[model samples]
Structures are given as C-alpha cells and as structure tokens.
Target: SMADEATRRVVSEIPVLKTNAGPRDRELWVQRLKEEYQSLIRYVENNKNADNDWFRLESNKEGTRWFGKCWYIHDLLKYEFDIEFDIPITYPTTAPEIAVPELDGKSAKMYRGGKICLTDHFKPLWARNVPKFGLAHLMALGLGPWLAVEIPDLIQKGVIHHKEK
Candidate 1:
C-alpha cells in the first residue's frame, strides 16, 4: 500500500535492525552504541531538571534494555514518571517500547504492561525512524512530547502531584 511504501521510504535512510548480527555488524553497532551513550550523557548534563522539565537515561549493559525517568513542573506542580526500553533483537527495524510502571493505571495513555501509549503522534515518528531512533531520540521526540501533554492533565485531575523537598 502507499502508506507502507512511505514507511519504507523513511526507514531506508536509517540503519536496518539486525536480529543475528555478524562480527563486523556487531563492531559497527558497538561503535554506534558508544556514540548513543555519549549523547545520552550529554543530554543529562546539558539539561536542567527544573522549571517542570527533566529527563534521565540508562541501560544495564551495552545493546540491552534501558530505563529512564522524566518530569516537568507546571503551575507549581511536579509531574514525573519512570520509563524503560528494551532493545529488540531486530533493532533499527523496531523502536524500543517505553514503559512507565507507576503510570500504568493513572491514565489511559499507557498499555497494561506500563508501556507509554504512543498512539497518535509519537508512534508514527518512532516507526519512521525505526533503527535510528536511539534512547536519546526516543526521549526527545517521543516521550518528551507525551510529558508535555499528559503531565499537566494528570496534575489537574490529581493523578500526579508535587514532591516535598
């Protein structure tokens, strides 16, 4: 179909996800992971977790699942949530799913497994970037936007609240 073709056209510009990568492919991916890791570090260092804005990223091992938390303050209220991503065996062809455990039942914007509901906007953008949308990219373009909208509504509805520090 035309939509499928458009999807392929977008993904063609990025690396294809690999299921059983060979030595050279592994080496290249290792390097790419290193680059991705550095970008994450820079993102944390460069951004201030103030003014109702925040983000964090981490993974247990290279080429493995990663987890993070994000928050933003609005109207003097603090809204934050934890999220995790597991790299698929067929990476680059699949974007890691983001999960927020505590956010599971608070709203309908998440899956039963705590995965953030990437329905309208983010789902498509992440799919289009498939293999190229690393942790940083996912947060910046995907989850960040989710926070922008959902957080405020959660606050107003008393689903999320401020922490006393």
Candidate 2:
C-alpha cells in the first residue's frame, strides 16, 4: 500500500484506478497472473524427465538464441510481463517491463520507460474489452507474441489498415 499523502495524489490523478478497482482486483490480478504463469511453467515441472520451457532465469544454463539472454525475443517478453507483479517478481500492479524502439529490426508501440508495451493483452486493449478475457485467459495470449507475425514485424513492413497505422 502507498503512504496516505502519496495515495491522495495518485487517487486524484487516476481516480478510476483508485476508485473503480479494489485491492481485490490488484491481488486477484496478480494471483491470477502468477498462477497462470505457474501453469505455463508447469509445462517444465510435469516433464522434469523431459524437455521444458521453464529455465533458471539469467542462468546462462542453456545458450540463448539470436542475441543475449535479455534480448531473447519471445521468452524475454513473457518474462518481463510476469515481472510486473508479485513481491519477488515486483510490487503489485507496477506493470510489466517492455522492450522499446525495436528488436531484431522490428518496431512496435512502446512506452518511454520500456516498462510497458501495447498489446491486445495490455491496458487500452484490455480496457476496451476487445477480447473480454479474464486473467486466466491472459495466460494463453501472453505466451503467444506472434500470430503469424508480431507487432514489430508488422510495423516494420510499413503497412497500415484504413486510416489507422
């Protein structure tokens, strides 16, 4: 929780967050995220005798592909998304860290701090209720950064639809 004075300032700026959502939403969202994340990790857990997706983060246990560990295209994106919450992962609701500018010569919408990315799974997309998914469902989408092509790949092609880009 925030200090009272800081709370007041934050509340005044984003009343919808302070008022519209309760601590339950924050906790619930985080738990849902972490649990679903665990499910994804379970892929490795269940197959301990087999290959798995879960890796000791920053382990350098296995060779990272394309670039360095932090620059791993798909895995790193999901890792950043998960780091947005949980005590060890991070303070609750702090939002995920995102990669910015471009990667592998790709460009996509990004925030200044690179701590957040625009995806059908994040804020505006989630807020608009375009997909109407619950936290559990986010687990599925979060892992799928590329549906044929990723946002960065699409943007790199210089293609636009309608009056939008």
Candidate 3:
C-alpha cells in the first residue's frame, strides 16, 4: 500500500466483489457479472465526480470481452487510445490482461499487443486477492498508472502527437 495517495484512495473506494465465479460457471457467472458491473459503474462515477475521468469501457453480452477508450492529458492536449481485455477462462483467479492495441511497440513496458505491464508488486497483490480484484481494480492499479507514466514519455519522445481536431 505504498502506492501514492491518489491511487490508494481510488482502490479503497471501489468495493470488492464477493463472488468467485468465472464465465464457465453457468448461473454463478451471472451473479459475478452483476457484481463486476456494479463495481465498474461506481468507479466510473467516482472518477467523474472528481473530474478525473480517464476511460470508458463496455463488455459483450456474455461479460467476457471488454473494450474501451482511455485518455490522458499532456501539455493541455488529450491523447486517447483504444483499450481492451478479455475475462480469461480462469478469470477471477487470473487477472484480466488489459491492452492498448494502439500503443503497441511504443514502450518496453508493454507486451506484444500493447498489454500494459503491471508491476511485480501488483501481480502478487492480484494473486493474493483473487475474486476480489475485478476490471475496476485493473483500471485503477494497472492501466491508470501506465498512462500516467507512459503517456508523457511518449509525448516527449514524439512517438505520439496531439490531434489537432
């Protein structure tokens, strides 16, 4: 919990899901989905309330595929990228692997498909708290920090440019 105050605050406000179900569990999955949606919505509202909104996300009907746009402001300009992740077959146990396909190849911190690399600290934390960590937690602890760190570097290095329109 040595994370900065802002990150710790965001993580603390998002409630943890109680269900341990994954997509393979027929009826139980639905309950997990409900809890997931509730947590995500609350996180979104929390960001908006503080004018710190950074992303938009939606899942397919089965609640497996998630896609969205995440943006960061640098030099008073907005830089946006497409983001997505799949709820793994072993989800709730396997934390979702979030990616920014548009950012592929731009950073060493990313995987082949622009999957943001979570810190070593975060991976163990997720494993220790399985069934409690969901998409929202991934956003707060995973993507959010990646953007805060990478976006500015990308901008400064001229790898990504501000769109005039």
Question: Which candidate leads in TM-score?
Answer: 3
Task: Let me know the TM-score candidate 3 reaches against the reference structure.
Answer: 0.93
lDDT of 2 by residue, 83-160 (tens): 221122221233323333223233344445333244553454334432223322222233234322454454347542
List model 1 lDDT by residue over 1-165, tens digit each: 775575454333333332333123677768767766665665555455423237777777566777777777687556667778777766555667788888888877887878877657556766665455566666665677677788888888988868787
Each candidate's lDDT (Cα)? 0.65, 0.32, 0.86
- Global Cα lDDT for candidate 2: 0.32
Candidate 2 TM-score to native: 0.30
RMSD of each: 6.0, 14.8, 1.8
After superposition, candidate 2 runs with Cα above 4 Å error: 1-40, 45-94, 100-106, 113-116, 124-140, 146-148, 151-165
lDDT of 3 by residue, 11-101 (tens): 8889789898998898999999999999999999999998888899998999999998988987777888999888888889888889899
Model 2: colliding residue pairs: none
